[PDB]
Each structure stands twice: as C-alpha cells, then as structure tokens.
Amino acid sequence: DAWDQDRFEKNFRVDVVHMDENSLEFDMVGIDAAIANAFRRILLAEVPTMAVEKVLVYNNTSIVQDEILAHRLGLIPIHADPRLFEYRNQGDEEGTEIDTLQFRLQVRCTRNPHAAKDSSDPNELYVNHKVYTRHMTWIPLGNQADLFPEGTIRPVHDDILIAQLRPGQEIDLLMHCVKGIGKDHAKFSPVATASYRLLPDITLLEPVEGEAAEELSRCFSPGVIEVQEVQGKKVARVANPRLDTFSREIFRNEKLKKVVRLARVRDHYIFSVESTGVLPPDVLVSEAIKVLMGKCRRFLDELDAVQMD
Amino acid sequence: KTALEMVQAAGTDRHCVTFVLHEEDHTLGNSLRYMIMKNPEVEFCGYTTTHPSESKINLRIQTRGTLPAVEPFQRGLNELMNVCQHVLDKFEASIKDYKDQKASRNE
C-alpha cells in the first residue's frame, strides 16, 4: 500500500534509553531502513564541525616530525559551535572573523632546577616534557572575544598527549581551525560511532524445564533468558531480549535449537550516538535530521527554478 | 552551479526521466527511493550511483496512467520533509521527557 502519513504519525515513537554526556541510546519504532540509514549516514559524514586545517610552524625542535605533528593536531576536537561559523571560500589563507579560529601551541622544555636529587623520574627532572592539549592558547581575532565568553573556545578533552619533549626542544606553531563536513576528511566527524540494530525476539516454542533451561540460560547473553522456579522445577522465560548480542549460540546445541525462534523485530531500530564532545549528542541527532530536510529543500528550489510554468 | 539534470528518454516521453542529482550519495538517493516507491502511480523507481569517483546519482522514475514524472518526484521530496519534520518533532519532545525525568526523580 501507499504512504499513509497518519499511519506513520500513529505508529512512530522514539524511546530514549540512556543519555548522559557524550552518549545517547534511543529506539525508533516504525521507521524503515532507508530513512534510519540516512540518519546514521548523515551523522557520520554530513553534520559539520570545526577542526584544525593549517599549521604554521616555527622551531619544531621536537622528535615528533613536522608533518606528523600537523596531522596529529588535525585530529583534536575543538569545542566550538559549528553553527556559528561558515565555510571558507576557496583560496583565502587568512580567513576573517567568521571563517577561522586560531590557537598557539608554544611549549619549551627545561630541566627542573630544584628537588632533582638521585632521581630519574621525568616529572621531577623536566618541566613541560609532555605537551598536552591544555597547552593550547586560544588567540581570538577580529571581535571573537565578544561572541564567546572566556572558556568556550577550547580543546575538548584537555588530556591528549600531543608530543613529548626533552630539554632544549621547542614547539612554536600556530593553528587555523576551519569548518568542514565529516566526509571531506575524517577529522571533522562529530561522532565516535553511530549505528543501529534491530531489536531481537526470542520465542520459546516449547516449555523447557530442569537442567535444559540452565543449558538454555547460558547460550544467550547474560540477562536475556531467566530461569525461575515454579514448584520444584526450573522453567525458563525470556526477559528483556534487547540485551542479546545475536550470536546464534543456541543453534549449536542439538536438542535445543528447535525450541527457540531467534529472529528480529522489523522496523524497531535501537540507535546509539556517541559524540566526541564538540556538540551534545541530542543536538547532533537534531542537526542530522535537519540536514536531510535541507537536502530536500535544495532540490525543491531547483525544481522551482527549472519549471516556472 | 546547477544541481539537477532531467534527461527525457525519447524527447517526447516525459513519463520516463532519469533525474541526475548532483552532490549526492545513497543518503538521499535511498530515502527518496523509499518514498517514490510508496506511490501507486509509479511503475518503477530505482537509483544508482554513477561511479564512486563521482558524487552524483541517477534516479529513474517512470509512471503509469499518464503522469509526468516530476510529480512523483516533488511528492517524493515533500513527503520526506514531512517525515523528517515529524521525526524531529517526536525526537525533540521525547528528549525533553527524558531530561525532565532525570531532573524530577530523586533531585
């Protein structure tokens, strides 16, 4: 049959399971794979973020190479809101207030003068010997100090080991964060991984008792099938089949492969979106739904431009 | 600068037209292929990417009962806007039911 819009708006429901910071798990009853996969593939490659693109070095005296340091700085998540910023029009080396952000990783390593007796520990001998990302100084340009407060534009994780130094060695570079989508380069993706899975169903076609129920209790994942006592015997009943890894272990045992019908429930996807921290995870799912609408609106504008009629 | 090419089959035949959508992949090309196929006035709707070195898709739409094949394609797009808008409205109003149960539970 055809697309009854009021059959969709009656049977669709989203059931959020867990949402702390930098994680999200929700269900979607009644959406089909060709839309849910579009949400998944817009999270991984279409939702834009900010990340480092140019690196302007002076005195990389370190052991980490000049090329590998720039590639290593590219993969560091910047905690800037992407929606505030624009794409760079091609060919500008110095972007404006709106295009680019800046940083400066300026670390010099030196020996620790005092409390350096009979020890070989690096924390007691050296100062600034592990270049973390909390050594990055945001350098606002134009009027960017007014748009964002003190402490908004920032690296996300502030523990990422960039380099590792010894005395005499210096890193004095300057960065340029840009805007991009997650398929131009993988350093722009907002998500650790975004995926889904159908909710499995398990249907005991035969009542199993005794030790065969304990043999059934260990074929599935811990928490799927529960063994309960009903007057001296131990009968098994399923309980939350969401926990199942769908590993097909019951189809190895011979007498018990013909009592359960391990299949999947159609159109009952269980997403999970884990952000890298640039945006909160329930704002990344919103700006992934809102990108597919923009892809529709651009082609509707092109159809309005082709046929005036 | 353009983003959509309509290619008629035999010039006079506006029932079969292969929409060549620029800057695309299987994200919108497979969601549209699900929506245009939900039309009973469409005999056949399939898409293919041209070559993965390119980033445009083909999208064949061909109809029965004498409809020009841009009307299942406008209905193909607006009935996906109306689906993403409803998914957005049931998502943003189910996050809030979760936040306001995390707040008012033991805090």
């Binding site: 989203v14 059931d15 399971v17 269900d27 939350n240 | 189910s94």
Partner: peptide, 8 residues
C-alpha cells in the same frame, strides 16, 4: 539493551 524509560 538497558530497557527504555519512555514506555509504550
């Protein structure tokens, strides 16, 4: 595979 808190 925690159970949902927004029930049906």
């Amino acid at each position: 595979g925690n159970p949902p808190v927004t029930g049906p």
